[PDB]
Amino acid sequence: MRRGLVIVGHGSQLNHYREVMELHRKRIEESGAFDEVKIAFAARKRRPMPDEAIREMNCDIIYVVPLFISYGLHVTEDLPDLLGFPRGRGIKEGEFEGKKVVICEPIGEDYFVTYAILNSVFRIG
Amino acid sequence: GMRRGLVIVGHGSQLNHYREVMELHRKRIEESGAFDEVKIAFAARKRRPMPDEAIREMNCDIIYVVPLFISYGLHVTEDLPDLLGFPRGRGIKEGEFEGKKVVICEPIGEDYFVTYAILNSVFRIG
Numbered sequence A: 001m002r003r004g005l006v007i008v009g010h011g012s013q014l015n016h017y018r019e020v021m022e023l024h025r026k027r028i029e030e031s032g033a034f035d036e037v038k039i040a041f042a043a044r045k046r047r048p049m050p051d052e053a054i055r056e057m058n059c060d061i062i063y064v065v066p067l068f069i070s071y072g073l074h075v076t077e078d079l080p081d082l083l084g085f086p087r088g089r090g091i092k093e094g095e096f097e098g099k100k101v102v103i104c105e106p107i108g109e110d111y112f113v114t115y116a117i118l119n120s121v122f123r124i125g
Numbered sequence B: 001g002m003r004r005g006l007v008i009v010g011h012g013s014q015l016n017h018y019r020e021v022m023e024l025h026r027k028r029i030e031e032s033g034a035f036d037e038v039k040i041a042f043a044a045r046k047r048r049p050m051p052d053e054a055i056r057e058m059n060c061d062i063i064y065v066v067p068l069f070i071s072y073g074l075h076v077t078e079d080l081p082d083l084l085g086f087p088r089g090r091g092i093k094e095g096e097f098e099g100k101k102v103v104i105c106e107p108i109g110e111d112y113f114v115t116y117a118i119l120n121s122v123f124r125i126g
Helices: A016-031 A050-056 A073-083 A111-122 B017-032 B051-056 B074-084 B112-123
Strands: A003-009 A036-041 A061-066 A092-096 A099-103 B004-010 B037-042 B062-067 B093-097 B100-104
Touching: A003 A016, A003 A050, A003 B112, A016 A036, A016 B112, A036 A050, A050 A061, A050 A073, A061 A073, A061 B112, A073 A092, A073 A099, A111 B004, A111 B017, A111 B062, A111 B112, B004 B017, B004 B051, B017 B037, B037 B051, B051 B062, B051 B074, B062 B074, B074 B100
Parallel strands: A003 A036, A003 A061, A061 A099, B004 B037, B004 B062, B062 B100
Antiparallel strands: A092 A099, B093 B100
């Protein structure tokens, strides 16, 4: 099957943020775990918006991952509104111009982010 | 072996889930034993505790201040160093704050652990 990923970020006035999104895009695309990998933004009218990434992708299922720490306003309101998806917390399985689309949970709670905190001190790799 | 502390510095939210995420990271690292002390603080919209207050509560040689942020944005390059009286800009920053050694570390954004966290929002292992 063809499985898609869209990474949805906040963006920033400073360039580093977009550059970080492109870094994960490239790392994940070159791994081959998904057939298609794109980035999108969910704040400040930043482009691409999630709908623009999704419309370009020809996949049987597309996962949208919020690159955000918590269930806040951007994740529970801005992102769902942008997709026409339900507001609030939790994973959301939906259809979007006849494609299957699942918004995932924010990364914040993951043990890998605990480890990223540790590794900001330990600098392993 | 030196007395090492960690201050995790976050953005916060008008909703509750950010504070609980911060608390969960603090609690995980406290129980792991990796550091002598772990505290949380905030670097947006006058949120509390601020980094200066977390540090003043700490009994350590060195304190590593870790930005819980994706990038070197306005919060990382302006708010966080202003709240510490450190100069603005990119990069790691090491100095002293009222007599204790403080290292502002890099934000977590570029870590391979963030790439894997992205993968695990999909794969949901653990």
